[PDB]
Motif scaffolding. Structure first.
Motif, mmCIF file in Angstrom:
data_model
loop_
_atom_site.group_PDB
_atom_site.id
_atom_site.type_symbol
_atom_site.label_atom_id
_atom_site.label_comp_id
_atom_site.label_asym_id
_atom_site.label_seq_id
_atom_site.Cartn_x
_atom_site.Cartn_y
_atom_site.Cartn_z
ATOM 1 N N UNK A 97 0.720 -1.227 -0.055
ATOM 2 C CA UNK A 97 0.214 -0.058 0.109
ATOM 3 C C UNK A 97 0.953 1.267 -0.076
ATOM 4 N N UNK A 98 0.523 2.344 -0.403
ATOM 5 C CA UNK A 98 0.852 3.744 -0.367
ATOM 6 C C UNK A 98 1.146 4.128 1.267
ATOM 7 N N UNK A 99 0.196 3.770 2.206
ATOM 8 C CA UNK A 99 0.357 3.841 3.371
ATOM 9 C C UNK A 99 1.785 3.436 4.098
ATOM 10 N N UNK A 100 2.154 2.032 3.491
ATOM 11 C CA UNK A 100 3.415 1.323 3.852
ATOM 12 C C UNK A 100 4.612 2.196 3.569
ATOM 13 N N UNK A 101 4.444 2.802 2.243
ATOM 14 C CA UNK A 101 5.492 3.436 1.415
ATOM 15 C C UNK A 101 5.579 4.791 2.380
ATOM 16 N N UNK A 102 4.517 5.456 2.668
ATOM 17 C CA UNK A 102 4.578 6.871 3.658
ATOM 18 C C UNK A 102 5.136 6.771 4.920
ATOM 19 N N UNK A 103 4.998 5.449 5.457
ATOM 20 C CA UNK A 103 5.363 5.021 6.716
ATOM 21 C C UNK A 103 6.849 4.977 6.733
ATOM 22 N N UNK A 104 7.560 4.185 5.600
ATOM 23 C CA UNK A 104 8.871 4.360 5.304
ATOM 24 C C UNK A 104 9.853 5.578 5.230
ATOM 25 N N UNK A 105 8.819 6.594 4.556
ATOM 26 C CA UNK A 105 9.290 7.751 4.159
ATOM 27 C C UNK A 105 9.360 8.652 5.391
ATOM 28 N N UNK A 106 8.396 8.464 6.289
ATOM 29 C CA UNK A 106 8.124 9.287 7.423
ATOM 30 C C UNK A 106 9.229 8.501 8.578
ATOM 31 N N UNK A 107 9.582 7.234 8.498
ATOM 32 C CA UNK A 107 10.615 6.771 9.218
ATOM 33 C C UNK A 107 12.080 7.439 9.183
ATOM 34 N N UNK A 108 12.187 7.470 7.711
ATOM 35 C CA UNK A 108 13.689 8.029 7.024
ATOM 36 C C UNK A 108 13.854 9.576 7.592
ATOM 37 N N UNK A 109 12.730 10.449 7.728
ATOM 38 C CA UNK A 109 12.745 11.939 8.091
ATOM 39 C C UNK A 109 12.765 11.725 9.517
ATOM 40 N N UNK A 110 12.059 10.982 10.142
ATOM 41 C CA UNK A 110 11.924 10.993 11.798
ATOM 42 C C UNK A 110 13.408 10.582 12.257
ATOM 43 N N UNK A 111 14.070 9.648 11.739
ATOM 44 C CA UNK A 111 15.385 9.301 12.015
ATOM 45 C C UNK A 111 16.447 10.328 11.970
ATOM 46 N N UNK A 112 16.272 11.188 10.794
ATOM 47 C CA UNK A 112 16.970 12.390 10.811
ATOM 48 C C UNK A 112 16.858 13.284 11.671
ATOM 49 N N UNK A 113 15.799 13.595 12.237
ATOM 50 C CA UNK A 113 15.338 14.624 13.103
ATOM 51 C C UNK A 113 15.682 14.163 14.590
ATOM 52 N N UNK A 114 15.619 12.743 14.764
ATOM 53 C CA UNK A 114 16.122 12.296 16.052
ATOM 54 C C UNK A 114 17.636 12.309 16.153
ATOM 55 N N UNK A 115 18.244 11.971 15.129
ATOM 56 C CA UNK A 115 19.856 12.010 15.185
ATOM 57 C C UNK A 115 20.580 13.196 15.170
ATOM 58 N N UNK A 116 19.988 14.196 14.452
ATOM 59 C CA UNK A 116 20.672 15.424 14.357
ATOM 60 C C UNK A 116 19.943 16.583 14.966
ATOM 61 N N UNK A 124 15.349 16.907 6.428
ATOM 62 C CA UNK A 124 14.421 15.954 6.859
ATOM 63 C C UNK A 124 13.273 16.586 6.764
ATOM 64 N N UNK A 125 13.077 17.650 7.463
ATOM 65 C CA UNK A 125 11.602 18.575 7.786
ATOM 66 C C UNK A 125 11.047 18.870 6.423
ATOM 67 N N UNK A 126 11.897 19.369 5.354
ATOM 68 C CA UNK A 126 11.534 19.790 4.155
ATOM 69 C C UNK A 126 10.941 18.706 3.298
ATOM 70 N N UNK A 127 11.722 17.532 3.416
ATOM 71 C CA UNK A 127 11.161 16.469 2.521
ATOM 72 C C UNK A 127 10.144 15.728 3.211
ATOM 73 N N UNK A 128 9.909 15.656 4.559
ATOM 74 C CA UNK A 128 8.597 15.127 5.430
ATOM 75 C C UNK A 128 7.392 15.909 4.638
ATOM 76 N N UNK A 129 7.491 17.188 4.685
ATOM 77 C CA UNK A 129 6.249 17.994 4.338
ATOM 78 C C UNK A 129 6.095 17.932 2.752
ATOM 79 N N UNK A 130 6.963 18.024 2.025
ATOM 80 C CA UNK A 130 6.884 17.756 0.732
ATOM 81 C C UNK A 130 6.166 16.517 0.262
ATOM 82 N N UNK A 131 6.481 15.364 0.908
ATOM 83 C CA UNK A 131 5.946 13.964 1.027
ATOM 84 C C UNK A 131 4.449 13.995 1.510
ATOM 85 N N UNK A 132 4.098 14.478 2.449
ATOM 86 C CA UNK A 132 2.760 14.381 3.156
ATOM 87 C C UNK A 132 2.072 15.272 2.431
#
Ligand code: 5SW
Length: 113
Positions: free
Chosen positions: A60-79, A89-97
């Protein structure tokens, strides 16, 4: 290729355009980012997502969105917030949503009638 693969490749290409330096293109290694694996337990990157589309791993697109959000969240958690990676990461997250909003997915669902 399948219709879902074509749809997900389209979404992925648009998102990857937002990362010209390829900071999210492949996994973050501990050599590139000291102690990354100590903090981030569920890594994600665009290359892993591309491989999942090619292998027909998204049901599903929902699963794809979850992977994308995980990628962005990881960058915002680490950095920290004043870093290039956190900001991108914040820019990419908002663009994807924006691209994969419930409104846009409902319009796509209605067009499949
Ligand atoms: C996939 O490769 C790379 C990742 C990062 C990178 C990404 N993200 C998301 C991070 O959080 C991160 C955090 N700290 C340090 C580095 C990174 C940086 C890179 O170099 C500057 C490359 C190298 N390539 C561009 C050739």
């Amino acid at each position: 290729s399948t219709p879902i693969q074509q749809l997900l490749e389209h979404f992925l290409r648009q998102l990857q355009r937002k990362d010209p330096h390829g900071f999210f293109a492949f996994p973050v290694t501990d050599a590139i980012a000291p102690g990354y694996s100590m903090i981030i337990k569920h890594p994600m990157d665009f290359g892993t997502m591309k491989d999942k589309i090619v292998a027909n791993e998204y049901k599903s697109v929902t699963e794809f969105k979850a992977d994308f959000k995980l990628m962005c969240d990881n960058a915002m958690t680490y950095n920290r917030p004043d870093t290039v990676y956190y900001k991108l990461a914040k820019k990419i997250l908002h663009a994807g949503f924006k691209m994969m909003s419930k409104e846009r997915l409902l319009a796509l669902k209605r067009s499949m009638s």
